[PDB]
Structures are given as structure tokens and as C-alpha cells.
Amino acid sequence: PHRYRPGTVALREIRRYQKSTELLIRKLPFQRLVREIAQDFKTDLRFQSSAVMALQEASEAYLVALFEDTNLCAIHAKRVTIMPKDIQLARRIRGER
Amino acid sequence: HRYRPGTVALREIRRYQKSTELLIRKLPFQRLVREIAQDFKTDLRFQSSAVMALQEASEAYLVALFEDTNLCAIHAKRVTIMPKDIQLARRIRGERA
Amino acid sequence: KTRKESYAIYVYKVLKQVHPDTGISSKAMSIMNSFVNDVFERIAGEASRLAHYNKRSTITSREIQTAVRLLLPGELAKHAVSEGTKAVTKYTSAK
Amino acid sequence: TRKESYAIYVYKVLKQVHPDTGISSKAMSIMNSFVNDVFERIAGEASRLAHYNKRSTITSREIQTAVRLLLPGELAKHAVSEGTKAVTKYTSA
Amino acid sequence: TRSSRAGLQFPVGRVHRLLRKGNYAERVGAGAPVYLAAVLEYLTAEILELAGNAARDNKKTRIIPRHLQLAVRNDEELNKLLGRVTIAQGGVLPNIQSVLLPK
Amino acid sequence: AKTRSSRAGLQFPVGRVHRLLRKGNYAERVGAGAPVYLAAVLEYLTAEILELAGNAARDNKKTRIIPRHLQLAVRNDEELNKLLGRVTIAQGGVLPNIQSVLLPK
Amino acid sequence: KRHRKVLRDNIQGITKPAIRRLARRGGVKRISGLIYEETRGVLKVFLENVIRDAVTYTEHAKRKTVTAMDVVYALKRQGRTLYGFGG
Amino acid sequence: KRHRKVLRDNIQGITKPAIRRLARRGGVKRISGLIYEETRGVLKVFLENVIRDAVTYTEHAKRKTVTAMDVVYALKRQGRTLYGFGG
DNA sequence: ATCAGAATCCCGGTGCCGAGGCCGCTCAATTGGTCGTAGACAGCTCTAGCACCGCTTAAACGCACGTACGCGCTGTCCCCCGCGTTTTAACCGCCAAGGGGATTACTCCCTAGTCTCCAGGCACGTGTCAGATATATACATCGATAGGC
DNA sequence: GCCTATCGATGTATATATCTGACACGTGCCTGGAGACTAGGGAGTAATCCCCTTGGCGGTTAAAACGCGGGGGACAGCGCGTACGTGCGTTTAAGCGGTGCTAGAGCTGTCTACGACCAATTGAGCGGCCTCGGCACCGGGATTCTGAT
């Protein structure tokens, strides 16, 4: 049986996604999630096709720049695993609450 | 008598957070403010309020750095902040890239 | 000489309505003078972009109401609409 | 209907610099957003400077003291040079 | 005077002059600065209501710049509005984290 | 000539910028020297970015400029990274970046 | 199998390998397991702060359609300016 | 003792117990020793970014005196708005 | 839980100077009439949005194995804290200007303003090659047990 | 007990080959930039004004500086053991296209009410003056911790 060492598929995975430039989250579950958040504020809201897309790019790059800034805290604890105390640190330093 | 290490600093933190005045010495600060004016335009004058306002935006930036730094050096299972902690806490805020 | 304008009497009138037995230092009086001009530049600075996005050229009472609900957080915006709309409604009925 | 853009003016600069290089529409719509985004950064800053100094006008000097505020060290020192080359050739014309 | 015809304290005309001379629009409607003075008035009446409570919390009758720092930072909805503003002669809030206290 | 962009020796418009200063409610009296200055500073910034994009666009061997090239140029240059500090570019990816701790030895 | 379907909560639409693909772009080699309950709480509290601004621009303009620049002019309020989507 | 004085670098004017008093306000119990060489480098790189804006406001207004609002209008450029100093 | 010890905490007496009124006074708010533009409103095309199905095909789902992390433990070194005491520069107070901020009044050029005009710059069609996609093809790296040190 | 080894095993890179899509390019055309002119006021300039910033000295006084001793913490190494990654087969809904209508955006066209504009008038709101009491203030006695037993 062939099986890589655990911790080597992720290294080839990182060097694939930093070369690609497409959207990782799919367009349909993100479309249905946006509609349920607006329903608490206003009923009967249509959406343009670009406003689902243009919400998505500013939702992904907020996560990747968060996942860039919760990675360094895990290296700061001499770790690799980004345990969820790192994110609630990494939003505190950027002032987001 | 000889106090233990720790209850003297914890009387300072109960004293300085109650107080509200300037903790950096005035004349060494205004010799600092004047000496970085020469790198941009020589022969400048300063009002006595303008190196008072420049202290309260210098004091309230180090305090809001050390409060962010102490939450980092807590997180790495330590109690002592370090120069490696500051360069992390400046990296996440977007000031130092 | 130089006659500067301020918000000195207007804050001290308001403080006496909600606290009669209360003074205020001049050092704090310079804060609320600088607090209001920070807020009023932030609201009207947002009201300029609202009328410009819809290609209009008039700040009416509506754009402030859609600038107050933008800047202010969740709880404070529900009050300043209610305080704001009552003020115009007493102003429109009066002469 | 009629929509004002910058797509021709980014293109002529592109043939001025990289004379064999095309540009996609998605890349062209970034610069058309980017050119407009430097505008309200500069003109929003130059408007704040003339109101602060009790003036009521925006000359070519207020742009020069708004460019040095925004752009960094190596970028602003060339923009003021290329700006002053443009105004002097206009006032000579 | 429009400050009393709407039943307010802040000057309507001084705000209304600051919306025309300030170049925030070409035209300024008459409904705008009467609405604007009340928004400023409630927000000023919000700050001093929590500032003056800090005066009785420390048994003083005048408001120093410490008590404004105590009101804005303790409040949760006023702190999101002024999250980046620093206040001169304010200090910080008294907080000690849990691992720093002696066992 | 007649056009002001030739009379300033530029390519960006001037009359369009001069209208887009006046109707934007910035100040009462826009001076006639400022759109000559403003169109130059807009040109040099576009001449900075489009030159840096096609450098990296040549390295992936493509004639056209794609938004991946525009993200790759303005994040590489430190003097452009300080200007576009909090701007998200659509279709950007990231800079290739792995830290030295996660690598095997 | 069918008597009633699951109809899950629409926040689990941002699926577990989808979040994992985001951390791989963000330069993370090894991810925890409790983070998948956390980062849905981050994105729900983030899209709340944008769409609240996106409605109030559209509610003022007397429309029913949150267009492209009712998001871009909402993002510029938060300081995270987007490019590429026109204007 | 006198033949020539030390005339130290004016960045050591922000003295070692002064920095220590700042960390005590910031809720730090125990401080390192190598931090005193670090935090002078932070304050020197911070006052450079404010005074560069403070000069350019004054250089435009044809003055020689960096007043109070050539600092407050320089700090508002950086987003760290100051109060209390008038206007 | 006890003991004595330094270090806040309060109570009170003092007093000083900043806030609180007071008054005069002027720029500016108000009242008023005039006025033309923006904007409200109504009516009108029609492009793009929403809802379902139909269908292929991929990613998501789940399960087991295990292994490399996370994790807590001990021990050890030292780099810090804390006090004690010289030492020095800061704070305060003052002398001593004089540059420059900020005031005035005046002059004029430059901008806004309307007018007339005329192509630069638009939308839209239209070929066409530049990348999309691929399969092949070679060449890498990757563990794995193999060999010999 | 270790470095090398050498495998095929999966994985990317590179190869040409073929082709679809948007990319430029041409056209007609219309809105908006340019030429032209003239009136006004903002900005320039000069001049005079008096604050207020810079200077250093004297003295003082508490912070800063220097050193030491010790102990708490950073530090690394160890052994645990679970919660991870990995891979497989299985199931599922995202993708895609495709129907279906119609709201709703965007458009023109009216039309009138609103706010700019201007002049006339006076008092709210400024600076300056003035006085009194809130809080700094210390000293003592009272307390609450602290370390040591």
C-alpha cells in the first residue's frame, strides 16, 4: 500500500493553492447563506449576480488574511496546529471584536 | 523587609492604572521630538502644546502596544514579554510588514 | 483680536439638564468641543458621499438618517432615529 | 447608456510603456477602479487642506502637499518631479 | 431662533452655516441641520450621563478628563464608535489578566 | 493643438479631470493649474503598476495582463505595498509564502 | 430513505474541506478540529457587518436590488476597499 | 571628573525605568532585558511617521511653527485621532 | 491560622485659582421677498432576476490506522526583580529678547460665468489569435527496505 | 546503527496540437471639452502689531543609575497518547443548462415647490473681568494586606 508521511500532502496542497487564483468556497452554498443574513434586516431582497460574487471575494480575503495572522500565533507557541484560542487572539490584536 | 518577587510589580500596576498623567520625562522627550525634525526640514519651532500633544499620542501608542504584547506573551505559556513578542504584535496590526 | 467659535455654552447647557449639581473642567470642555466636531465631520462627511452616489445634489433630512444608521452601532442608531425624527416633527408643526 | 471610464487612457499608457502587451477586461476594470481610487484619496485630501488653511480654492500647490502626504518615500519623490514637469510645460504653452 | 422652535439646545443656524460654508453639498435642505443638531444633542447627552455617574462613583462634582475615559471604555456601544480615538490625560481601564495574579 | 493633454505632454485627460474636480464638491474654485498636476500624478502611478505587471507577466509567459499578475506585482514592490495596504484585489491569489518551520529537514 | 430531509443550517454550506482549502492558501500546514465550529462564527459575524451596510445604501436609494456598488460602497465604509467590480 | 561629557544619543532619554513604567500601565508584570533596546526602535520609527506629516502641513502653510493642529491633523491622517487639544 | 510590618485608606484642616457669573458689544442669525432649478412623480420598455426541473460529475462524507504532533512532566540555569545608595538631570523659576504669528488695508489678476462650437470618445460590430485544455512525454522527487558501514 | 540507495510510485513539467473565447480595431455619432469673452473677489503683498518661543542660569530634589543577591521562570529534554492526517469507497449536491414569468431598474417628461440669494435688523454669543469654593493637599490615625512562624 502507498501512503505518504502525514505532513507531506499538505505541503503539496499549499503549493497548489498559492498558484491557483479561483474561489475555494463554491458559488451555490455561499449564495444561499447571504440571503438568510439579510432577512433579519429586510424582507424581499433581490441580489445582482455580481453582488454575490463581490461579497465573496471580500469574504475570502478576510479569511485568508485571518488565516495568515492566526498561523504566526501558532508558530509563536512553538506549534503547527492552529487551535481556536489562536483566532480569538488574532482578532484581538487587529482590534476586531 | 524583603518583599517577594511579584507583589511589588502588582502594586505598581494597581497604582499606575489608577493614575492618569505622563510617564515619560518631558525634557528628554522634547529633545527627541526636535531631533527628528532635522531629517525633514531644518530650523523649525515648536509650541509648548505641540510637544504635549505629541507625548499623549506617543504614550497612548506604547501602552496600547504593551497591552497587545502582554496578551501574546501570556498565550505562549510565559509571563515575560520579549522583543520577539513585539515584532509579532506589530506584524498582525499591519504596521510592520 | 481673534474671536474663535466653540461649543462651550451648548454642552454646559445640556449637562445641567441631566445633572444639575455637576461642574466640568475646562480640560474636559476641550474634549467635548473636539468630540462634537469629530462626530459632525464624520456624519456630514458621510452625508456628502450618500447624495453623490445617487447623483443628487441636496442633503435633505433623509441622508442624515441613512448616515446615522451607518456610523453609529446597533443600539445607539435606534435611539438617534427616534430622537431625530421627533425633532423635525416638532419643527415642522411649529412656526 | 453612456458610462465614463478610463479604458482608453490606461491603454495608451500601456502601449507607451510595454508596447507589445495586451490586457484583459478584468484587469482593465481593476485599473479603472484604481485610477478613480487615487482620485478621492488625493482630492479628498487636497480639499481638506484648503479648508484648514482658511482658503477657498485648490491650486497646483495643494496637490503637491497632498501627494507627499499619501505616497511613500521613493514614490512621492518622483511624482512631484513628474508633476512639476507637467505644469511648467503647460504654463510655457 | 430655530434651536427653540424644534425644542433643542444646539444652534441650528451655526450647524446650517457649517453645511454650506463647509462644502459638504451644493444644496443643503432645511430639514437636514435641524435633524443634525438633535443627533449631536442626544450623543452629547449620552456621554455626560455616563460621565457624571463616574463623578459620583468617585465623589466629585466636576468632570475631569479621567471620567470621560471611564464612561466610553466601560460602555459597549460607545466603545465601538470611538474604538480608535485616544483621549488625552485618560489612562486606561484597571484590568489584570488571570495568570498575572499571585497564587 | 486644442487638447490640453498634448499641451501638458500627457496621455490622461485634463478637461475630464477638471470637470471631475468641480462637480465633486471638493472646493469652490478649482484652480486651472491643479488638473495639469493631478493628471501627471495619476499617470506615474499607472506607469508604475503597468510596468511592474508586465515584468511578472513575462515570467509566466503570457501576452495579456491578468489580475494574478497585478496582485503579484503590487504585493512584491514594498513602495506599492504601503499604498495599497488594505485594498482587496479580485482574482488575486496570494504571494507564494511558506515559513521555514513547516518545511521538512 | 426519504421521509423528511435534513435541510441543514446554511452555515454548514461553508463546508469542512472548503474551510480547509482556505487555510492551505493562508499558509497553514496542520489545522485543528475545533476550528470548523469557530470560523463559521467569524464569517457569520463578518457578513452581518457588511450586509447591514449593504441594505442601508439600498434602502436609501428606494430600490429592492443590492447591486455591485451597494457592496463596494459598503466595504469602503469599513476600510476594506475592493477593486475590479467597476467604479 | 570633567574633560568631556557623555552627551548620550537622545533616544536613551526615554529611560529604562520610564519604559518599565509604561509596561506596568499596560498590565505587564515581568519584563525582559532585551526589550529596552527594542522599544526605542519602535518609538523612533513611530515619531518619524507623525513628524513627517507634521512638517508637510506646516511647510504648506508657510510657517515655521508646528502648532497643536499640525499634529492633530497629522494624527487623523494616520487614523489615530486625538481629542482634548482643541478643534 | 496565627504573628508582626510596611504600605494604602481615610478624615480633616487648609487655600488656592479655576470655574461661574456678569456685563458689554458685534458679527451673524432671522425675517422677508424673489426665483429658477432640482427633484418628485408618473408613465413607459425590457433586461435580468427568481423559481422550479433535468443531469452529469465532481467534491464531500465517513470510516479506520496510526503516527507525529500536542502535552505535561522534571530538572536546571540564570536573568530577571528588589533593595540600598550615590548621582544627575529634570522641574521649576527667571531673565531677555525678537522672530514670527496674525492683524490690517489694498490691488489685481484669475477664475467662474454664459456662449458657441466641434471632434474626442463613446457604443457596437467584427474578425482572429491567445490562452484553454489535453494528452503525451519525460523527469523528477518520495518513501522503503536494502545494503554495507 | 547509519548513511546511502534505488526502487517504481505518484506527482508535476514540458511537449505540440487543436480550438473558443474575448481582445482589440473600425465605424458613426453625439456629448462635452475648447475658444472666447467679460466681471468680481479671493489671494497676494505690505505693513504694523505684540505674543511667545528660544535662550541659558540657578537651585533643588527626587528620579535615574549602579550593584548584588537570590529565586522564580525560561528553558530543554523526556514520555505519554490522542487527535490528528491519510486513503478508500460511497453518497450527495454543486454545476450546468434550461425552461417559466415579471418585478423592477432605468428611462424620459412634466412641473411645482424649495432653497439659494439678497437686504434689513437686533440679540444671541463672544471676550474680558471678576469672585468664590471644589479639590489638591498633608498628617495623622486607621486599616489591610504581606511575609514569616
Side-chain angles (χ1 to χ4, degrees):
Chain A
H2 199 292
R3 191 189 267 229
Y4 275 119
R5 272 196 93 180
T8 323
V9 186
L11 288 162
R12 315 197 338 265
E13 190 173 34
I14 285 178
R15 284 183 322 275
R16 181 172 64 241
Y17 290 148
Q18 292 182 356
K19 296 182 186 173
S20 159
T21 175
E22 72 180 27
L23 300 170
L24 314 171
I25 321 165
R26 275 94 52 205
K27 327 181 177 48
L28 212 67
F30 196 78
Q31 155 188 332
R32 308 184 290 114
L33 163 64
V34 170
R35 283 171 205 271
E36 79 178 6
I37 305 170
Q39 279 309 307
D40 315 326
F41 308 133
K42 179 159 175 66
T43 79
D44 197 342
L45 267 180
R46 317 218 168 275
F47 271 87
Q48 284 214 354
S49 175
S50 306
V52 161
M53 276 278 122
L55 258 177
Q56 185 178 345
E57 309 269 5
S59 172
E60 284 199 29
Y62 167 66
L63 280 175
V64 182
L66 180 60
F67 278 153
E68 285 289 333
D69 295 358
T70 196
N71 185 27
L72 273 167
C73 315
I75 305 301
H76 197 79
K78 271 86 64 177
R79 277 191 293 119
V80 195
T81 294
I82 46 167
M83 299 193 304
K85 79 179 60 52
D86 270 320
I87 293 173
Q88 296 178 357
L89 168 75
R91 296 164 61 204
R92 162 65 51 107
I93 297 157
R94 277 152 48 169
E96 300 168 350
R97 284 289 100 206
Chain B
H1 57 83
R2 183 62 194 259
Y3 276 98
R4 297 190 72 253
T7 187
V8 194
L10 276 154
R11 200 169 67 251
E12 266 186 321
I13 305 174
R14 293 182 183 95
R15 170 201 176 198
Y16 284 114
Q17 287 168 330
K18 287 297 164 316
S19 170
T20 176
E21 58 104 20
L22 297 162
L23 312 178
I24 307 166
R25 293 288 100 187
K26 304 188 184 186
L27 181 56
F29 185 69
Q30 79 163 355
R31 285 186 290 112
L32 179 60
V33 175
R34 275 177 204 274
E35 88 164 3
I36 323 179
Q38 264 82 32
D39 291 354
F40 315 120
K41 181 210 181 49
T42 182
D43 297 14
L44 282 172
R45 293 177 177 88
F46 285 90
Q47 301 190 338
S48 159
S49 52
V51 308
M52 206 170 300
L54 258 172
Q55 195 175 350
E56 298 266 8
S58 175
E59 182 204 63
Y61 166 64
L62 283 183
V63 171
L65 187 69
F66 283 159
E67 266 183 14
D68 284 348
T69 317
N70 176 60
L71 273 187
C72 274
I74 280 172
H75 162 62
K77 290 193 181 183
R78 282 181 294 123
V79 77
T80 297
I81 65 187
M82 275 164 176
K84 39 166 283 193
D85 272 292
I86 284 173
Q87 278 143 349
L88 167 71
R90 287 228 311 163
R91 168 70 204 267
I92 304 181
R93 289 164 79 156
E95 306 176 19
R96 172 185 85 95
Chain C
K1 322 286 160 295
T2 312
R3 205 211 65 167
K4 63 100 175 178
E5 301 221 341
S6 69
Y7 279 74
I9 42 168
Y10 298 117
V11 169
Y12 182 64
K13 278 183 179 199
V14 167
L15 171 64
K16 284 306 181 178
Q17 286 185 358
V18 311
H19 280 94
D21 50 323
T22 289
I24 173 171
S25 155
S26 89
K27 277 183 174 158
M29 196 51 239
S30 163
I31 282 169
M32 308 298 298
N33 172 43
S34 196
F35 162 72
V36 169
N37 282 359
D38 186 28
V39 171
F40 157 74
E41 197 261 311
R42 272 207 267 156
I43 286 184
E46 196 41 70
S48 172
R49 259 174 264 130
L50 258 290
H52 187 275
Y53 285 163
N54 317 320
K55 300 294 176 182
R56 270 175 178 150
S57 46
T58 291
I59 294 186
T60 178
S61 90
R62 201 154 194 251
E63 293 97 9
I64 316 292
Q65 188 170 131
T66 63
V68 161
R69 279 198 276 124
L70 275 183
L71 271 72
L72 280 82
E75 185 50 53
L76 273 162
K78 304 174 187 179
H79 279 162
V81 167
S82 298
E83 180 67 42
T85 309
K86 173 198 58 183
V88 183
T89 318
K90 208 191 182 193
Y91 168 60
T92 45
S93 298
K95 196 170 183 184
Chain D
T1 70
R2 299 274 293 207
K3 170 58 189 164
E4 294 185 356
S5 170
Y6 282 77
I8 176 174
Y9 308 108
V10 188
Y11 192 76
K12 302 175 65 176
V13 171
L14 189 53
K15 298 295 123 180
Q16 174 151 336
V17 177
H18 270 177
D20 300 340
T21 299
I23 175 163
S24 68
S25 157
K26 191 67 102 190
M28 184 47 78
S29 158
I30 288 173
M31 316 299 301
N32 189 23
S33 185
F34 167 69
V35 166
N36 259 314
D37 196 36
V38 184
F39 199 91
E40 293 101 12
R41 277 197 209 186
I42 288 180
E45 187 54 79
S47 176
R48 188 181 292 117
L49 277 163
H51 160 272
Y52 281 168
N53 315 310
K54 292 300 184 52
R55 305 282 158 85
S56 77
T57 188
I58 294 176
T59 77
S60 163
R61 202 209 168 202
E62 270 93 3
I63 305 301
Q64 185 172 131
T65 187
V67 159
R68 303 244 198 178
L69 279 175
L70 282 177
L71 319 181
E74 286 290 327
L75 210 49
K77 208 215 292 196
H78 296 182
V80 182
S81 158
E82 280 201 0
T84 45
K85 269 147 53 56
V87 172
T88 47
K89 204 157 146 60
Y90 175 62
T91 48
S92 158
Chain E
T1 75
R2 283 172 275 168
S3 160
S4 89
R5 300 186 206 275
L8 290 187
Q9 318 305 311
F10 280 84
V12 187
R14 185 210 296 265
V15 162
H16 175 79
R17 192 198 70 216
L18 271 187
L19 284 200
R20 310 162 43 163
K21 201 179 59 60
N23 259 330
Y24 289 87
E26 163 183 355
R27 281 171 150 195
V28 169
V34 51
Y35 183 92
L36 192 42
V39 168
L40 300 191
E41 199 202 277
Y42 162 69
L43 281 173
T44 302
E46 188 45 62
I47 285 293
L48 318 165
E49 184 51 55
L50 314 177
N53 285 23
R56 292 156 179 166
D57 219 322
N58 302 325
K59 302 135 191 181
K60 317 277 203 324
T61 57
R62 276 191 319 214
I63 295 183
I64 67 173
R66 185 74 216 279
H67 292 164
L68 301 159
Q69 185 78 268
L70 282 198
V72 179
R73 295 307 201 258
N74 266 345
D75 189 276
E76 210 198 325
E77 300 297 318
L78 283 165
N79 196 24
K80 281 176 294 188
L81 181 51
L82 311 179
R84 184 61 75 187
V85 162
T86 176
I87 292 97
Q89 303 290 328
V92 286
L93 281 190
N95 54 335
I96 296 98
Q97 296 291 320
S98 88
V99 79
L100 283 308
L101 57 91
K103 272 74 67 179
Chain F
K2 311 302 161 182
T3 43
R4 259 197 268 180
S5 196
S6 88
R7 282 206 226 182
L10 298 191
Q11 310 298 327
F12 279 171
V14 164
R16 152 171 306 184
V17 175
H18 186 274
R19 186 209 52 214
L20 267 184
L21 277 173
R22 287 186 288 113
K23 321 284 283 178
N25 298 322
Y26 298 98
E28 308 174 6
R29 301 157 95 263
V30 171
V36 192
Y37 203 106
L38 191 46
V41 182
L42 279 181
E43 179 207 342
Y44 170 63
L45 286 165
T46 49
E48 190 91 19
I49 279 181
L50 291 156
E51 198 270 335
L52 283 177
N55 281 6
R58 194 262 329 276
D59 284 20
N60 323 306
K61 313 175 179 58
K62 288 161 163 51
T63 311
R64 297 179 209 160
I65 279 182
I66 213 58
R68 174 60 180 268
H69 304 144
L70 281 172
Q71 185 82 256
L72 267 164
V74 311
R75 296 276 92 86
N76 261 344
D77 214 18
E78 188 211 339
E79 65 198 22
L80 287 172
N81 212 328
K82 210 175 299 309
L83 173 59
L84 298 198
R86 275 187 295 270
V87 160
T88 299
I89 295 98
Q91 301 313 299
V94 281
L95 276 181
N97 191 12
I98 317 167
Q99 312 177 7
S100 180
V101 189
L102 321 172
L103 285 184
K105 310 302 275 187
Chain G
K1 56 101 179 178
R2 79 288 171 274
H3 161 53
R4 83 280 186 275
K5 286 305 291 179
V6 286
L7 268 75
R8 220 162 310 133
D9 198 72
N10 312 345
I11 196 60
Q12 328 280 351
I14 318 292
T15 47
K16 178 180 177 181
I19 286 148
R20 143 159 292 160
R21 280 191 319 273
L22 281 163
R24 291 296 194 259
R25 184 167 266 187
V28 192
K29 175 180 172 311
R30 214 181 171 277
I31 326 169
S32 175
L34 291 177
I35 191 169
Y36 298 114
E37 288 296 326
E38 168 57 50
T39 181
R40 277 151 202 157
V42 163
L43 215 52
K44 183 195 177 177
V45 99
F46 169 61
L47 286 177
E48 266 191 1
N49 291 351
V50 185
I51 292 176
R52 177 190 284 105
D53 294 338
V55 166
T56 321
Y57 274 84
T58 309
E59 275 191 355
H60 174 237
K62 311 185 183 193
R63 295 196 276 127
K64 308 294 301 311
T65 343
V66 182
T67 177
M69 345 209 67
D70 286 332
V71 168
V72 181
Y73 290 153
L75 283 159
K76 203 166 70 173
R77 177 80 256 181
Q78 297 220 348
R80 291 180 210 85
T81 312
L82 185 50
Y83 283 175
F85 280 102
Chain H
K1 56 101 179 178
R2 79 288 171 274
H3 161 53
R4 83 280 186 275
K5 286 305 290 180
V6 286
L7 268 75
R8 220 162 310 133
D9 198 72
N10 312 344
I11 196 60
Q12 328 280 351
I14 318 292
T15 47
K16 178 180 177 181
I19 286 148
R20 143 159 292 160
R21 280 191 319 273
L22 281 163
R24 291 296 194 259
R25 184 167 266 187
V28 192
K29 175 180 173 311
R30 214 181 171 277
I31 325 169
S32 175
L34 291 177
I35 191 169
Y36 298 114
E37 288 296 326
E38 168 57 50
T39 181
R40 277 151 202 157
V42 163
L43 215 52
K44 183 195 177 177
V45 99
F46 169 61
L47 286 177
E48 266 191 1
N49 291 351
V50 185
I51 292 176
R52 178 190 284 105
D53 294 339
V55 166
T56 321
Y57 274 84
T58 309
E59 275 191 355
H60 174 237
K62 311 185 183 193
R63 295 196 276 127
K64 308 294 301 311
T65 343
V66 182
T67 177
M69 345 209 67
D70 286 332
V71 168
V72 181
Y73 290 153
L75 283 159
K76 203 166 70 173
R77 177 80 256 181
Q78 297 220 348
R80 291 180 210 85
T81 312
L82 185 50
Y83 283 175
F85 280 102

